Design an enzyme around this catalytic site. Structure first.
Site, PDB file in Angstrom:
ATOM      1  N   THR A 113     -11.552  18.576 -10.653  1.00  0.00           N
ATOM      2  CA  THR A 113     -11.361  19.803 -11.475  1.00  0.00           C
ATOM      3  C   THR A 113     -12.484  19.968 -12.468  1.00  0.00           C
ATOM      4  OG1 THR A 113     -10.047  18.816 -13.222  1.00  0.00           O
ATOM      5  CG2 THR A 113      -8.843  19.635 -11.232  1.00  0.00           C
TER       6      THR A 113
ATOM      7  N   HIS B 226     -16.176  15.645 -22.646  1.00  0.00           N
ATOM      8  CA  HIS B 226     -15.267  16.580 -21.929  1.00  0.00           C
ATOM      9  C   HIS B 226     -13.822  16.126 -22.130  1.00  0.00           C
ATOM     10  CE1 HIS B 226     -18.896  18.117 -20.109  1.00  0.00           C
ATOM     11  NE2 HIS B 226     -19.183  16.895 -19.592  1.00  0.00           N
TER      12      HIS B 226
ATOM     13  N   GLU C 126      -3.637  21.705 -16.065  1.00  0.00           N
ATOM     14  CA  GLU C 126      -4.514  22.296 -15.051  1.00  0.00           C
ATOM     15  C   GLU C 126      -3.649  22.842 -13.920  1.00  0.00           C
ATOM     16  OE1 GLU C 126      -7.750  19.339 -14.375  1.00  0.00           O
ATOM     17  OE2 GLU C 126      -8.783  20.822 -15.687  1.00  0.00           O
TER      18      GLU C 126
ATOM     19  N   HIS D   4      -6.105  16.327 -19.808  1.00  0.00           N
ATOM     20  CA  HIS D   4      -6.495  17.693 -20.177  1.00  0.00           C
ATOM     21  C   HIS D   4      -5.445  18.306 -21.073  1.00  0.00           C
ATOM     22  CE1 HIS D   4      -9.470  17.689 -16.775  1.00  0.00           C
ATOM     23  NE2 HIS D   4      -8.561  16.816 -16.252  1.00  0.00           N
TER      24      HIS D   4
ATOM     25  N   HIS E 277      -4.281  12.527 -15.558  1.00  0.00           N
ATOM     26  CA  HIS E 277      -4.865  12.272 -14.228  1.00  0.00           C
ATOM     27  C   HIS E 277      -5.191  10.788 -14.133  1.00  0.00           C
ATOM     28  CE1 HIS E 277      -6.194  16.693 -13.874  1.00  0.00           C
ATOM     29  NE2 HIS E 277      -4.885  16.519 -13.553  1.00  0.00           N
TER      30      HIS E 277
ATOM     31  N   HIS F 189      -7.455   9.915 -17.588  1.00  0.00           N
ATOM     32  CA  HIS F 189      -7.814  10.843 -18.660  1.00  0.00           C
ATOM     33  C   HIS F 189      -6.783  11.941 -18.699  1.00  0.00           C
ATOM     34  CE1 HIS F 189      -9.484  12.565 -15.025  1.00  0.00           C
ATOM     35  NE2 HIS F 189      -9.151  13.737 -15.596  1.00  0.00           N
TER      36      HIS F 189
END
Ligand SMILES: NS(=O)(=O)c1ccc(NC(=S)N[C@H]2CCN(c3cccc([N+](=O)[O-])n3)C2)cc1
Ligand SMILES: [Zn+2]
Length: 257
Positions: free
Chosen positions: A195, A61, A103, A93, A116, A91
């Site tokens: 999330t 992911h 996000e 996104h 994050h 990590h």
């Protein structure tokens, strides 16, 4: 079999994780004109000098940089928080192109990516207990925009070729997460959730106002990772972001006037 593809993406998650349609889901849009300055918030205390990074992992992911959280080495305190939260991992996104990837959004603006830094409340003793509690986690969110390179990010970029596919990991010791922070610690804060599934409503979100600058070359290397495992059809790891969720009965507070 949740993910971010055509058939298992965020609009599907509610079938396996009904809390997807809950009262305190993340991320959210931050309307800068409706967020209230709260003079009763404290300066955030980000104490990373003793941080012990151990390993980087492609989990299918995103990629996680994992820390030794077996004692109080790297901690987040102050701001909206009661007590002590231990850094466990960070990590990102990110998007397929620079116009999307974050996000959280700011007046509906999407950043190219979002970092994050995940911390758990040491009054619950372990991470699995902390995620069962409304105040169990604190996530520090930092926007990325594309411009100048971020020097503190390049050690991460340069290991990604070694963890291309799901389940691959590499030793990642002595990485200093202070190199990922912006100048200002001004922030917005609200109660929300993870999330990703299982979407637990256990997070105090702290989202910095000031984005960090990374280079096009840096984010292009994120977009060369794979969601798939070794020897499986190549699916580029891009657009691993959940869109903004309804705010419902929640107020976003600002640390700054
Ligand atoms: N997007 S987000 O920020 O809302 C958000 C989403 C998901 C998570 N999930 C997390 S941190 N899951 C946990 C389960 C246990 N866990 C551990 C525990 C010990 C050691 C390691 N490890 O591999 O080094 N990992 C990681 C948190 C945050
Ligand atoms: Zn995240």
């Amino acid at each position: 079999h949740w993910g971010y593809g055509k058939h298992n993406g965020p609009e599907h998650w509610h079938k396996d994780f009904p809390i997807a349609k809950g009262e305190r889901q993340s991320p959210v849009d931050i309307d800068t004109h409706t967020a209230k300055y709260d003079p009763s918030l404290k300066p955030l205390s980000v104490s990373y000098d003793q941080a012990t990074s151990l390993r980087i992992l492609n989990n299918g992911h995103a990629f996680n940089v994992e820390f030794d959280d077996s004692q109080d080495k790297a901690v987040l305190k102050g701001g909206p928080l009661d007590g002590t939260y231990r850094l466990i991992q960070f990590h990102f996104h990110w998007g397929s192109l620079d116009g999307q990837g974050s996000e959280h959004t700011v007046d509906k603006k999407k950043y190219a990516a979002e970092l994050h830094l995940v911390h758990w409340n040491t009054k619950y003793g372990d991470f699995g207990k902390a995620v069962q509690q409304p105040d169990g986690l604190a996530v520090l969110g930092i926007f990325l925009k594309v411009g100048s390179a971020k020097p503190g990010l390049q050690k991460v970029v340069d290991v990604l070729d070694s963890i291309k596919t799901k389940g691959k990991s590499a030793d990642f010791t002595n990485f200093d997460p202070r190199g990922l922070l912006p100048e200002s610690l001004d922030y917005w804060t609200y109660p929300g959730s993870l999330t990703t599934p299982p979407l637990l409503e256990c997070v105090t979100w702290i989202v910095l106002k000031e984005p960090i600058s990374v280079s096009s070359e840096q984010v292009l290397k994120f977009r060369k990772l794979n969601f798939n495992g070794e020897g499986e059809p190549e699916e580029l790891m891009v657009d691993n972001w959940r869109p903004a969720q309804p705010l419902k009965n929640r107020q976003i507070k600002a640390s700054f006037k």
